[PDB]
Amino acid sequence: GSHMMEILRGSPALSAFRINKLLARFQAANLQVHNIYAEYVHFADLNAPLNDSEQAQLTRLLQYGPALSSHTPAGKLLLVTPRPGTISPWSSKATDIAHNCGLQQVDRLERGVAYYIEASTLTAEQWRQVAAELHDRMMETVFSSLTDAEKLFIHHQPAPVSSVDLLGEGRQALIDANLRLGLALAEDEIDYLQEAFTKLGRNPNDIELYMFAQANSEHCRHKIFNADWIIDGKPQPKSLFKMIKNTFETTPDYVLSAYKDNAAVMEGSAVGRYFADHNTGRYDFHQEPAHILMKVETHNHPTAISPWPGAATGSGGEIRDEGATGRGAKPKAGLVGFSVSNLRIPGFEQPWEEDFGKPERIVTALDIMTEGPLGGAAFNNEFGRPALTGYFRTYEEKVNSHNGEELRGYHKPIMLAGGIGNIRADHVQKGEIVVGAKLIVLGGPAMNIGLGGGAASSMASGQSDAAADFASVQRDNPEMERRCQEVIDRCWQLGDANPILFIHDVGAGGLSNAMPELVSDGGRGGKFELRDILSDEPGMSPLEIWCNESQERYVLAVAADQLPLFDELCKRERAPYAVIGDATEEQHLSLHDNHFDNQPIDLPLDVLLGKTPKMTRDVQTLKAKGDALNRADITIADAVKRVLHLPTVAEKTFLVTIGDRTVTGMVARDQMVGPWQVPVADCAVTTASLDSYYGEAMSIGERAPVALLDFAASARLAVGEALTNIAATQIGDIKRIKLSANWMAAAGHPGEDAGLYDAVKAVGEELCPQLGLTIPVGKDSMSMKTRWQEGNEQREMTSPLSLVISAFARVEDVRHTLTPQLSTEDNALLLIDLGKGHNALGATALAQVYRQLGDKPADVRDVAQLKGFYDAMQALVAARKLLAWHDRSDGGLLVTLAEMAFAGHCGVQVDIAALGDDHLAALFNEELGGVIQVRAEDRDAVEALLAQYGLADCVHYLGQALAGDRFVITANDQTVFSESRTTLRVWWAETTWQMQRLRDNPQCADQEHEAKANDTDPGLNVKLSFDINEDIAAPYIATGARPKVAVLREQGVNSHVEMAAAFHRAGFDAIDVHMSDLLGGRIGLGNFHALVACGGFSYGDVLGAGEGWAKSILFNHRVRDEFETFFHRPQTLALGVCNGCQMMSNLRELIPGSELWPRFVRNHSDRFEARFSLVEVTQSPSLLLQGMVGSQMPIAVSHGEGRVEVRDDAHLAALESKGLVALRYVDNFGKVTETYPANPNGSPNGITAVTTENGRVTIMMPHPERVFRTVANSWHPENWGEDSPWMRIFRNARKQLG
Ligand SMILES: Nc1ncnc2c1ncn2[C@@H]1O[C@H](COP(=O)(O)OP(=O)(O)O)[C@@H](O)[C@H]1O
Ligand SMILES: NC(=O)CC[C@H](N)C(=O)O
Ligand SMILES: [Mg+2]
Ligand SMILES: [Mg+2]
Ligand SMILES: [Mg+2]
C-alpha cells in the first residue's frame, strides 16, 4: 500500500583523476565548466517506519567506500539515477543487506549520483550536453531534484492479457499484431497460426503469439543450420547440422553427451571431488570420475547496444547452461572472445585505420573494448570462475572480397563466452519427469528486461528505434547466480539422492521457451500459475511475465516428496525459488492467472511446438580474385613496428588482469607466463581436483580475415590453430580433444551462404573426421552485419565468415605443460613449418596493417602432417624433451619469436636462410606450426623424432636463445632485422598501455608500462626463511586427532572450497559454516578453536566489500555476541582472507587488539586486479606466519577493494610502530613498494596483512589458499615439490592448536 521515501546522502563519488577526466572532456567540447563535484545519494522506499536504533543502522549501512574529501554542494544539481521502471542490481543487493540486518521495513534501496556543476554561460542547449556527458542514455536518466527519485518507486497495477481478434477481423488481425508486437513472422508462420486458432475456435492472446514468435526465431530455431541446400544448382545431401554430427558419427570416443543438452560432456579422470557432506557439513574428498562438460556461446546483438551488460549476461547465460547440464553440474573455468572494428584510440591512431562511420544507435569498437571486457569480468569475478584463455581481434577495412569492394568488419561485434565444468557420471543423462512433478523457477525475481531478445538477435544491427534499443539493454546480478549454483551443487552432491529430475537455463523467450522445452523433453505437459512466479515489477502483463529475458533463472522439475529437502537447500543458500506448476500426463500447456481469473495460455503442445516447413537455401558461390601484396611502402623494420601495434597481435593485459585467474585453487596454467608475467600462454590448464595432477585444457583457434579470400581455409586454420595452441600439454590420443564450433556469418550477404556451407563441410565432413576430432557442441549467429545512412548514402559493414573453434581435453599430467618462456641454458630453436614453404601472405596481420588483403592465405597444407605434428608434440611432451613452445599465428614467426623472447626476458639469434628468399614472407606468413626450444644435447634426437612423424622437410634449425637484449634475425651473412628485445616488448605493450590509460587511473597505467622498459627487472624471485618441504603438522596429523575449523561463508562467497582443502591438508576437519547456519542455531562457534572467513563477493560487495557480511553480524545481537565470545577466548585462532579480511576489518569492535587496523577500499588503479604479486613476510606477532619472517615469494591477488586506508597519518604511524604489519608488497628488486602493479592496489608501505596484538587473528588481502599447491602457482621455482611456501600458514595453525 502506502510507502514513503527517505533520502540519505552518501560519500563523494569520484576520485580526482575521474573529476579531471570530466573537466578535460567539458573543456574539449567548449563547455566552460569551472568545477564539478559528485556525491552518492541513497533512496530508501519504506513500508513502515524505522525507530531511532533502526534508522542509525540504515545510516551506518550506507557508509562505505573510499574516504574522499567532502564538499558543501554548490552550483547546479544534476542527479543521475537508473531510468524509471528499472531496478539496478545495486538495489537488489543493497536491499538484501537491509533485510538480512533485520530492516524488513525497507521495501527497496536505490542509488544515484548527485553532480554539482559550477559553470559560466551555458545556454540550456549546453546544459543538455553537460547532462549527456554525465550519464549512460541507455540505462540512466538525469533529474533536477533529489525528490524526483520518487518516480523510481511508483506502484503499478498488473496489466491485463490482450487478445488478437482473428475471429472478428480475419487474417489482418494477425498481420497487425505481427507489426505491432514485432513478431517477425514469415507468411507461412502467419498461415500456421491462422489455421491453429481457427481450428481452436478462439482468438489467440498476445502472449501466445509472442511465445510462438520467440521460439520460431532464427536465434532459437536454427533454421539455417537445419535447411536443405542447393549450391551452384546442385541439391546437397546434408544440412549444416548433419555435417557437424558427422564428426560424432566418425569419432564417438570419450563422448558421454553431444547435441542432447545445452553442453557436451566427455570423459574425465577419477579423482577426489572435495565438498561438504549433507549430513555432517564436513568437507571430504570423494574419489570418483570428474567428467568434463564444455560450452561456448555468444551475445553479439546486445553488446553492440549496451556492452557491459551484454558481455556480463553473455557470461551469465553460458554459466547457466553449464550448471544446467544433465541433472546439475559445476562450472570450473571460462574463456572469452571479442571481435570488433578498429579501435581508433584518441592520440594513438594507427596508419591502417580509417573512420568509416557507424550507426548512431550502436556504440564504437573502442567503447565495446572498454566496457565490454569489464562486464564479462564483473560476472566471472562475482560468480567466481577463473577466466583463463581468450582471443581479441580487430578488423575493419575496405577490401576487394567475394562480393567486390566492400566494408568488412565488426560493427556488430563477436562477444563470446565459454567454459568447462565438471559433472558426475550418473548425472549426465537427464532424468524422467514423473506426472505430478513440481515445476520450479530457481533464481531472480523478474522484470521487463530483454523482451523479444530471440527475434531482436535474429536481425542485422543499426536502423532500429529507441524502444527496441531499450529492450536490448540487459542486466546482470552475478551474486544471484552464485547463490543458485550453490543449490545446484548441494543437489548434485547428494549423489543418488539428487532431487533434480531435469534442469535447464532460462534464456531467449524466457519462461515461454524454457518451461515448454522442459515438459516437452520429459514427454509431459504442464499447468502453471502466473501469480506464483516471483516478480519485481507488479505492472507487468502476462506476456511480459512469461516472455521477459530477466537473468539468473533456471527451470527445474522435482518430485513432490522432495520439495521439503529442496526448500531447505534453497533457504540455507538464500537462493530464491518458486513452485509455479505441475507436470501433467496430457501434453497440454496451461497458464492460469489467479489475479484476473482467466487463462492466458491454453494450448496443446503439438500446436505450440509445431514447425512450418524446413528452409531451402538456393545459393551461389562467389570467390574473391585477390591481388598480390603491394610492397612499395613495406620494409621489414616498419612491418615489425606496425604488426606489434595491431591489437590482435599486441599484448592483452587489459583483458587478462581484470579477470580472476585463481578462484577454485585448480588453475595450473593461466595466460601470464614466467617471472615477468607476460600474457602469452597458448592454452589454459586446470587440475581436475585439489588432489590430482590430472586436469583439463582449453584452447581457441580463429582466423576470420582469411574467409575474405577462402572460406574453407579459414575454417581449417581455426581448427589447426586450436590444435597448435594446445599441443604442448600432456594429453595423449588426439581423440581426447573435443571441439566447440561457433559460426558467425552475415547470412544472405552475397557469397556468404555458399561460403558457410563450404566451410562447415571442410571441417565436419573432411578435416575433423580425418584427424579424429569430434565437434560435440556448437552454436551459430547468422546476422553479422550492420546497415546505416551516412549522409545521403546507404552504408553497410559485414563481417567475414568467422568460425571460432574452442578445443577441450582431459590432461594426463598438468605438471608437464610447456609455455613460451625461453630458457637460456644451452639450447636449440627449431621451427616446425606446417606451411611447407608456401609462406602465404594473404589475409595476414602484415597485409592488414598495410590496408590490404593480399592474394592467397594460409591453409592446412597436409592433414597427415598436422596429425603427425600433434602426435610428435605429445611424444616430446611426455618424454620431457621440450624446454619451450609457442605456436605461430597472427603476426607470424616474427611474433612467435618476439613473444618467446619477451616471456624468457632474453634474446634470440636466428637465421632464416632456409625458409626461402622472400624474408618478408618467411617472417610474416601465418601458416600453421611454431617454434620448439630443446636442450642443445637433444637437438639431433628431437629432429629424428620429428622425422619419424613425416615432418623432416618442415623442420628447420633456427638458432638459439641467448642471455641479453638482442633480437637478431640473419640470412647467411646479411642482418635481416635486429632490434633491442626491450624496445620490441614495449612497442608490443603500447595498445594495453593506451587502453589501461583511458579506462583506469592513468598513473597506474603509466607505471606498469614504464616498468616494462627496465631490462634489469629480475622478474619474480623467491627467498625462503624455512624449509618448504618440512611438514611441521605431520606429528599432529599422525595422531589422528583433527581439530575442526569453521570455514565461514556468506551468500556470494566463492573461495571456500580451496580454503577448506588447505586446512584439510594441514590436518583439520573443515566444516562448512554458512552465515545462515549461525543465524539458524545449527552451528555454534563455541565448538570451534579456529575460524576462517573466506573470499569472494558477499552481496556483490554492495555497500562496500565485506560490509554487508560484517554489519549482518553486528546487527543481530545473538550472532554478534557469538563472534565476540569466540575472539575473546584465550586460545582461539582466526584468519580472514580477501573478502574475509574486509569483513573482519569491519568487525573490529568485536576483535581484541585490532584498534589500529585499517580499512580496505577501492584500489588506486580503480580496477579489479588479478595478479601474481611478490610479497615479503614481515615481523609481527602473527602466529600463522611463524617461521616465515623474511621470506619473499609470490601469491595470488584477486581484488578490487584491497587498498589499505587509514584515518590519517597518525593512524598509519601507530600501526607501523605497534608492529602489526605482517605482509608487504615488494617489487622484483625486493624493496617495499607503492608502485603499480608490483603493489597492485596502492596500499601505503605495501601493507597487505595485519595481525592483532596477541597474534591470534590475522587478516590479509592475498589468497594463500589458492596457491598452497605448487602446481597452482602461475610461476614457481623448478625444484619445488607438491607444497608451496604458503602451505606453512595452515600447518602453523595446526601446530598452534596442538
Ligand atoms: N579476450 C580475452 N580475454 C582473456 N584473455 C585473452 C583474451 N584475448 C586474448 N587473451 C589471452 O592473451 C594471450 C595472447 O592472446 P593471443 O595472442 O590472441 O593468443 P594466440 O595468438 O596464442 O592465439 C593468451 O594467453 C590468450 O588466452
Ligand atoms: N577474492 C576476493 O575475496 C575479493 C574480495 C572483493 N570482492 C574485492 O574484489 O575486493
Ligand atoms: Mg597471439
Ligand atoms: Mg598461440
Ligand atoms: Mg589465436
Rounded Cα gap, residues 1046 and 1063, in angstroms? 10
Does ligand 1 have an atom closer than 6 angstroms to the CB of 1054? no
Distance from the CA of 1195 to the center of ligand 3, in angstroms?
27
Report the amino acid identity of residue 529.
Answer: E
- Crossing angle for the helix pair 478-492 and 563-573, nearest 10 degrees? 140
Residue 1263 annotated in active site: yes
Calculate the alpha carbon distances from 412 to 403, 454, 461, 469, 783 in Å: 19, 16, 6, 14, 9
574: Cα separation from own chain's centroid: 24
Q: Let me know: does 291 contact 359? Beta carbons within 8 Å.
A: no
Q: What are phi and psi of 1177, to 5 degrees?
A: -90, 130
Distance from the CA of 999 to the center of ligand 5, in angstroms?
25
Rounded Cα gap, residues 76 and 38, in angstroms? 11
CB half-sphere exposure, 800, CA atoms < 13 A: 33
Calculate the alpha carbon distances from 1199 to 930, 1096, 1144, 1171, 1260 in Å: 36, 9, 16, 9, 12
Rounded Cα gap, residues 299 and 1247, in angstroms? 41
Q: Let me know: does 699 contact 294? Beta carbons within 8 Å.
A: no
Does ligand 2 have an atom closer than 6 angstroms to the CB of 1052? no
Site of grid cell 506476456: 543
Site of grid cell 539468473: 552
Distance from the CA of 853 to the center of ligand 5, in angstroms?
19
Residue 764 DSSP SS3: helix
- The active-site residue, picked from 218, 322, 537, 1265, is 1265
Q: In the PDB record, what is the listed experimental method?
A: X-ray
Query: Phi/psi class of residue 975: alpha, beta or left (left: φ > 0; alpha: ψ in -120 to 50)?
Result: beta
What is 1053-1098 written as a DSSP string? B--HHHHHHHHHHTT-EEEEEEHHHHHTTS--GGG-SEEEEPPB-G
Which grid cell sits at 935? 636442450
Q: Let me know: does 294 contact 777? Beta carbons within 8 Å.
A: yes
CB half-sphere exposure, 321, CA atoms < 13 A: 28
Rounded Cα gap, residues 732 and 694, in angstroms? 12
Does ligand 1 have an atom closer than 6 angstroms to the CB of 338? yes
DSSP tag of 157: P
Rounded Cα gap, residues 991 and 969, in angstroms? 25
Mutate to test the pocket of ligand 1, among 374, 379, 395, 671 (most ligand atoms within 8 A of CB): 671
Q: b/e map of 1087-1102 (b: 16 or more CB within 10 Å)? A: ebbbbbbbbbbbbbbb
Q: For residue 1006, which of 993, 1024, 1020 has the smallest C-alpha distance?
A: 993
Distance from the CA of 889 to the center of ligand 3, in angstroms?
6
Rounded Cα gap, residues 729 and 247, in angstroms? 23
887 is in an annotated binding site: yes
- The active-site residue, picked from 491, 1138, 1141, 1176, is 1138
Question: H/E element holding 335?
Answer: strand 330-340
Q: Let me know: does 310 contact 415? Beta carbons within 8 Å.
A: yes
Q: For residue 824, which of 947, 689, 959, 700 has the smallest C-alpha distance?
A: 959
- Structural domains of the chain in order of their starting residue, each with its CATH number: 4-153 (no CATH), 1034-1297 (3.40.50.880)
Which residues does residue 970 pair with via DSSP β-bridges, in sequence order? 911, 975
Resolution (A): 1.8
Rounded Cα gap, residues 475 and 1106, in angstroms? 23
- Crossing angle for the helix pair 206-215 and 187-200, nearest 10 degrees? 140
Q: For residue 1192, which of 1221, 1169, 1223 has the smallest C-alpha distance?
A: 1223
Does ligand 1 have an atom closer than 6 angstroms to the CB of 654? no
Does ligand 2 have an atom closer than 6 angstroms to the CB of 1105? yes
Rounded Cα gap, residues 1250 and 1248, in angstroms? 7
Which grid cell sits at 999? 579506462
Which grid cell sits at 210? 509472442
Ligand approaching nearest to the C-alpha of 1201: 2
Residues by chain with Cβ below 5 Å of ion ligand 4: 682, 725, 887, 889
Kindly report the number of other CB atoms within 10 A of residue 190's CB atom. 18
Which residues does residue 1194 pair with via DSSP β-bridges, in sequence order? 1174
- The active-site residue, picked from 956, 1074, 1263, 1276, is 1263
Which residues does residue 885 pair with via DSSP β-bridges, in sequence order? 932
- Crossing angle for the helix pair 1056-1065 and 1287-1297, nearest 10 degrees? 60
Q: Let me know: does 152 contact 95? Beta carbons within 8 Å.
A: no
Q: Sheet harboring 33-46: ordered strands across? A: 4-12, 33-46, 106-119, 76-82, 140-143
**First-to-final CA distance of the chain:** 60
Does ligand 1 have an atom closer than 6 angstroms to the CB of 208? no
Kindly report the number of other CB atoms within 10 A of residue 838's CB atom. 17
Sort 667 into a burial class: Cβ within 10 Å, 0-12 / 13-18 / 19+.
buried
Rounded Cα gap, residues 895 and 888, in angstroms? 8
Report the atom number in ligand 1 closest to the C-alpha of 886: 22
682 is in an annotated binding site: yes
Q: For residue 724, which of 714, 734, 712, 735 has the smallest C-alpha distance?
A: 734
Does ligand 1 have an atom closer than 6 angstroms to the CB of 725? yes
CB half-sphere exposure, 420, CA atoms < 13 A: 30
Rounded Cα gap, residues 313 and 551, in angstroms? 7
Report the atom number in ligand 2 closest to the C-alpha of 1199: 9
- Crossing angle for the helix pair 172-181 and 187-200, nearest 10 degrees? 120
674: Cα separation from own chain's centroid: 23
Rounded Cα gap, residues 340 and 370, in angstroms? 11
Q: For residue 389, which of 809, 712, 997 has the smallest C-alpha distance?
A: 809
Residues by chain with Cβ below 5 Å of ion ligand 3: 890
318 is in an annotated binding site: yes
Sort 564 into a burial class: Cβ within 10 Å, 0-12 / 13-18 / 19+.
exposed
Q: b/e map of 457-474 (b: 16 or more CB within 10 Å)? A: bbbbbbebeeebbbbbbb
Q: Let me know: does 248 contact 740? Beta carbons within 8 Å.
A: no
Q: For residue 1089, which of 835, 905, 1298, 903 has the smallest C-alpha distance?
A: 1298
Q: For residue 764, which of 805, 732, 709 has the smallest C-alpha distance?
A: 805
Rounded Cα gap, residues 1055 and 1039, in angstroms? 29
Q: For residue 1248, which of 1142, 1095, 1168 has the smallest C-alpha distance?
A: 1142
Cis peptide before 1262 (omega within 30 of 0): no
Rounded Cα gap, residues 72 and 281, in angstroms? 52
Q: b/e map of 740-756 (b: 16 or more CB within 10 Å)? A: bbbbbbbbebbbbbbbb
Q: Let me know: does 547 contact 211? Beta carbons within 8 Å.
A: yes
Distance from the CA of 771 to the center of ligand 5, in angstroms?
20
Q: For residue 629, which of 440, 826, 456, 400 has the smallest C-alpha distance?
A: 400
